C-alpha cells in the first residue's frame with residue numbers, strides 16, 4: 001500500500017521516504033480497489049510503526065467496554081491533537097466503500113452515558129460497535145470525531161499522511177498540509 | 190459476526206451451536222453491511238477454530254485458497270497427516286466473505302495457475318507484478334478441473350469467515366461430499382459473483 | 394414433465410405460466426423418477442420453445458453444450474444475429490436433467506477442449522474414440538475460465554429439459570446476469586453432481 | 598450402440614451383420630452406462646429399421662389415448678407374436694436403471710376398462726403413462742406384457758436381438774434363442 005520507492009520510517013525528524021508523490025499513487029491504488037478515506041488518526045511514533053507495518057489490532061483486554069473502538073478524525077487539526085512530550089505521526093484511514101452504510105452520525109457527544117441509548121438505536125444492536133462506525137461532535141481542535149468498531153477498524157488499510165508534525169508544536173498549522181492531500185481528503189461519512 | 194446466542198466450537202461430531210437458522214441470520218447481517226460470499230475453505234479442527242476466532246493471518250503464488258464448489262473445499266476439510274495424538278479425523282468448512290467493493294479485483298483465467306504462462310497472464314489482469322495484493326484469481330485446479338480461487342494475503346486478512354452448516358462425516362474421513370448433505374437454505378445463499386476475465390479498466 | 398396447469402410459452406417478457414412454485418413441483422416429480430439436474434442451457438425463443446416441446450434432437454467435438462453456472466448459459470440466451478424480422482431480443486434459460494444412472498459417464502478435465510492434447514485426454518477418460526456417446530465432458534471455457542459441459546448427442550437426445558425460473562432482461566439484451574435475479578428456491582435446487590476426473594472403472 | 602463391425606440390416610433373410618458376439622459387446626457397453634434390459638419388442642422389418650436407426654418416437658396422433666405406450670415383453674415367445682404374412686424382427690429394449698422405480702405391476706390385464714382405475718393409483722397420476730411403465734398379464738404366448746409410457750419409451754436405447762425369425766413360422770422355437778443371450782436377458786421389472 002506504500003507504493004514503491006524506499007522504506008517508510010517514522011521519525012521525529014519526519015516520516016522517512018514518504019512524498020505526497022508516493023501518497024497520490026498509493027491513494028489511487030486504494031481507490032481502484034474500492035477503499036475510501038474516512039479521516040486521520042494521530043498517534044506516536046512506535047504506535048504508527050505498528051499500525052502501518054503490522055495492521056490495526058484491538059488489545060485482548062477490555063473486551064466489553066461499551067465505547068471500545070479505533071478513533072479517527074476528519075480534520076487533521078483534531079487528529080493532530082495526538083502525538084507522544086515528544087512528537088508523533090499522522091496516518092490516513094481507509095475502509096471499503098461498502099461499509100459506509102454502517103457509518104452513523106449523531107449530535108450527542110460519544111463516550112458519554114446519555115449517548116449510549118441513542119447510538120444503539122442507530123447501530124441497531126447493543127454496543128460496542130461491531131462493523132459500524134459512529135461520528136458525533138466533541139473534538140475541540142474542531143468538533144466531530146469518529147469511532148470505528150474494532151472489527152471494522154482491523155479491516156481498514158492505513159497509510160502515512162503527508163502532513164508533518166513539528167517538535168516545537170506538540171494547534172496544527174494550515175500552511176503545513178500539502179494542497180495535493182488537501183484534495184485527496186474529501187469526505188464520505 | 191456469528192449471530193444470536195451460544196458459543197460456537199469445532200467438534201468432530203459437528204460445529205456446536207451452529208444451525209442453518211443461525212447461518213441465515215449471520216449472512217443477512219453481513220450482507221446488510223456490504224459483505225458478499227465468494228467461497229468455502231476446508232481445514233482441520235484447530236485451523237478452523239482459530240480462523241473463525243482470530244482471523245486469517247498470513248512466493249509468486251502466495252495466497253489463501255478458497256473454493257466456490259463446497260465439494261472441492263471438502264477434500265481439505267480433514268487432517269492430512271496424523272496430528273500430535275496420531276489422529277486423522279474430519280475438519281470443517283468455513284464460508285468466506287469479502288466487501289462487495291473489492292469485487293473489481295477478482296479476475297478469472299482458464300490457465301491452471303501452474304501453467305508456464307499463467308504468471309504473465311495473471312499479472313496482465315491483476316495489473317501489477319505478483320504477489321496478489323488486494324486481488325484474487327480463480328482458475329481450474331490442475332489435475333481436477335474444478336475452480337480454485339486464491340485471495341492475495343492483504344485481501345484475505347480482511348475477510349469475514351463464519352462456519353458453514355454443511356457437516357463433514359466422521360464415519361467417513363476422506364470421503365466425497367454427499368450433495369444431499371448440504372442444507373437447501375445454505376445452497377440457496379451461495380451463489381457467487383461474476384469475476385472479470387479481462388483486465389481492470391479504471392473506476393469512475 | 395412440466396407440472397400442474399397452464400400452457401407454457403416463450404415470450405420476450407417472460408415464460409408464460411412458469412413460476413418457481415411450478416418449477417419446484419416439476420423438479421420433485423423428475424427427481425422422484427430418477428432424474429438429476431446437470432446444468433443450464435441458454436437460447437433464443439424459438440429454439441427454447443421447440444426443445445422444451447419437441448426435445449433435443451441432433452465432428453470430434455459434436456455435442457450439446459450446457460453450463461452449471463447460469464451466468465455462462467445466460468450469455469447465449471439471446472439472438473446472436475438479427476433474425477428474420479431484424480430483431481435481437483432476449484432468449485430463455487432451460488434446466489437440463491439426465492438419469493442418475495448415467496452419471497458414471499460424466500468426466501472432468503482442466504484442459505480447454507481446444508487444447509491440442511484435449512482429445513486424447515478426453516478419449517482416455519471416456520474410454521473410446523470421440524464423438525461422445527452416452528458420455529459428457531466438463532472443462533473450462535477457453536478465453537473465460539468458466540466450466541462448460543458437452544453432452545454427447547446420444548445422451549443429450551435422452552434428457553428432460555424444463556424451463557428455468559431465472560428471467561432474462563428484455564430492457565438489457567446482451568447484459569450480464571444480475572445474480573440477485575435468480576430465485577433462491579431455484580438456486581436451492583441447483584447443486585450439481587461430482588463428475589469423475591479419472592477414467593471409468595467397471596461397475597459392479 | 599451397435600458396437601462395431603459392419604452394417605446391421607433387417608432382412609427376411611435375417612439381421613445382416615449381427616452376431617451374439619456383437620450383442621455381448623453392445624450389451625456390456627450399455628450396462629457400463631447405466632442401462633438395463635426390460636424385455637423384447639417384436640415388430641416388422643421397416644419398423645425395426647426405423648426404431649434402431651431412427652429411435653423410438655410416438656406418432657403425432659391420438660395424444661390422449663388413455664393406454665398409449667410402447668409395448669414390450671419379457672419372453673420373446675410373446676414378443677415373437679409380432680412380425681408383418683411376411684416376417685419381422687425382434688429387438689431388445691433398454692432403460693436407465695434409475696427409472697425402474699417407476700415400473701409397476703398389476704394382476705388385472707392392461708388396456709381393459711377395469712384396470713384404468715387401479716393403474717392410475719399405482720402410477721400416481723391420471724393416465725396415460727408419463728415416465729412410467731406398467732406390467733400386467735394378458736400375453737397368450739405367455740402371460741405378462743409391459744407398456745412403456747411414450748416419454749420413457751423414447752428415451753430407451755434399442756438394439757437387435759440375436760433370436761431370429763423363420764419365414765415358415767409366422768409359436769417361437771426354444772432351440773433358436775442363443776444361450777449366451779439367454780444369460781444377458783434376466784429381468785429387473
Ligand SMILES: Nc1ncnc2c1ncn2[C@@H]1O[C@H](COP(=O)(O)O)[C@@H](O)[C@H]1O
Pocket residue numbers: 042043044046047048050051054055056057058059069070
Ligand atoms: N497496532 C495497533 N493497532 C491499533 N492501535 C494501536 C496499535 N498500536 C498502537 N496503537 C495505538 O493504541 C491506541 C489504541 O489502543 P486502545 O488503547 O485499545 O484504543 C491508539 O492510540 C492507537 O494509536
Ligand SMILES: Nc1ncnc2c1ncn2[C@@H]1O[C@H](COP(=O)(O)O)[C@@H](O)[C@H]1O
Pocket residue numbers: 639640641643644645647648651652653654655656666667
Ligand atoms: N420409430 C418408431 N418408434 C416406435 N414405434 C414404431 C416406430 N416405427 C415403427 N414402429 C412400430 O409402431 C408401433 C408403435 O406405434 P403406435 O401405433 O403409436 O403404437 C409398433 O408396432 C412399433 O413397432
Ligand SMILES: NC(=O)c1cccnc1
Pocket residue numbers: 040041042043071072073078079080082145146
Ligand atoms: N487518537 C486520535 O488520533 C484521535 C483522533 C480523534 C478523536 N479521538 C482520537
Ligand SMILES: NC(=O)c1cccnc1
Pocket residue numbers: 229230231232254255256261262263265266337338
Ligand atoms: N482448503 C481449501 O478449501 C482449498 C480449496 C481450494 C484449493 N486449495 C484448498
Ligand SMILES: NC(=O)c1cccnc1
Pocket residue numbers: 433434435436458459460465466467469470541542
Ligand atoms: N447455450 C449455452 O447455454 C452454452 C453454455 C456453455 C457453452 N456453450 C453454450
Ligand SMILES: NC(=O)c1cccnc1
Pocket residue numbers: 637638639640668669670675676677679742743
Ligand atoms: N408388439 C410387440 O412386440 C408386443 C409385445 C408384447 C405385448 N404387446 C406387443
